Amino acid sequence: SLPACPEESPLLVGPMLIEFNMPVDLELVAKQNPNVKMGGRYAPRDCVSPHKVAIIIPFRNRQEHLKYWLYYLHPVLQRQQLDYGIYVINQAGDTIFNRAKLLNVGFQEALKDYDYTCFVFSDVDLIPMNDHNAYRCFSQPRHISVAMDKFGFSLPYVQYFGGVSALSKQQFLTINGFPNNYWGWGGEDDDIFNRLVFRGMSISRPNAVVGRCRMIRETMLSDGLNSLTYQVLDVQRYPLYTQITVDIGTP
Amino acid sequence: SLPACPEESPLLVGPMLIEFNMPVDLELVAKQNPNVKMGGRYAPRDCVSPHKVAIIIPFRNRQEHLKYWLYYLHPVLQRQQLDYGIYVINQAGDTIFNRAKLLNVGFQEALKDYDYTCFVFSDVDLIPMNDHNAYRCFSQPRHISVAMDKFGFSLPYVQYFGGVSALSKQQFLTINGFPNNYWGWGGEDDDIFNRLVFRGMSISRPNAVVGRCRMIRHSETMLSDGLNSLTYQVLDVQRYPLYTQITVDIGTP
């Protein structure tokens, strides 16, 4: 019935100022984005998007950062004319953090809501400075956070495929998702760039200016999606996001 | 007879001023480094170095840049107490450039002079700003150019394992060297990161400050495409005081 959305959205505004010297009230953010449905779900009214994107945020005790993330990304994602939903994967307990495992949980859980075909894995503390940085999938795995605010050496904050990146369902399934046994922060050695290589994939990215983000301030075949185990303890449908609280075990 | 050189050389000075305004005369540079022998060869007089390093530069019509590279790196390499030689691999003709294939030639040709055990592959237009950045090999593949001088975003110039990197002879042979069929400038698409992964190796590097480099300016297929399938024709070999230049025909796409 509806027409397909254009290939490039005409609603983009380009670079935007990101400042964190202003308190955020999510009740106001919700009234500013009234087309977002309960649970953080949105689709264009005027056209059909081919981008069915689940944005997955690994999370634990970062509510202030999340307020800023929602305040800044909901307008961006709509301007990009995406058919998206927001899934916050909250790691229950005080175990060592396991980013990769939570991303696997988010993939499995988001698919219970809707047949997403693209998955954006995003740290809660990275805001894109230009809405030309598409939050969706490409013919190759996509690295969305390319460089940081002040355009310095960026590998510490984003590694090769960290910070914000995107994988289609097929790309995610080809590598059997992320590993589940990397507890803690391992740097550019725990980057799953290795998994993309084994399956003959490379990295796509925008240019470093469009890709700027600002900060709020083998074993593969057996360790991954097919061996994932976890227990969901809570699911909360807030106006602007879904939060899933899970027990992912211990190292 | 001689003692082993220390693990860290006592001659290191740390950060360095790098400027590209003074014209360079290689006859004067040779008089500044009188211990460098014909062909750009040096070994310490006072100790035996465990680092037998061939520095291989893929090259074509960049003589001005090459002057600066020699002016700045010969002092650095000597201070690092290395047993090294300088090999410039000049691609004959003005065909489309093939960085990776030239690197394979340099590895094969350097070994005809001397039994090097470490190979540093360095773009001619990258100068290290700190002599603590070791131009030699490690237990894992080594990425020497980590970050750029000022605007630190470095991925376009260094990729994952480009710019300046080092592979021991064993590490190089394990991945069957570099590919030979990547014609042109491919960026991080021509990067051999996949080959290191395929063989269960990772990247070692210094921290981004020690690893800072400045750019000269004024502004499956692995097992079958590599060293074992390399073909080329040497057209000239010239032995200058400060470097060996090998001019080769590496064919066309």
Numbering used by the authors:
A (entry chain B): 126 to 342, 364 to 397
B (entry chain A): 126 to 344, 364 to 397
Paper text:
Beta-1,4-galactosyltransferase 1 (B4GalT1; EC 2.4.1.38) is a family 7 glycosyltransferase residing in the trans Golgi. In the presence of manganese, it transfers a galactose moiety (Gal) from UDP-galactose (UDP-Gal) to an N-acetylglucosamine (GlcNAc) residue, with the formation of a β1–4 linkage. B4GalT1 possesses a type II membrane protein topology, with a short N-terminal cytoplasmic tail and an α-helical transmembrane domain responsible for Golgi localization, a stem domain (amino acids 45–125), that is believed to be mostly disordered and whose function is still unknown, and a globular catalytic domain (amino acids 126–398) carrying the sugar transfer activity. Previous structure-function studies of the catalytic domain of B4GalT1 by x-ray crystallography revealed that the enzyme undergoes conformational changes upon substrate binding and during its catalytic cycle.
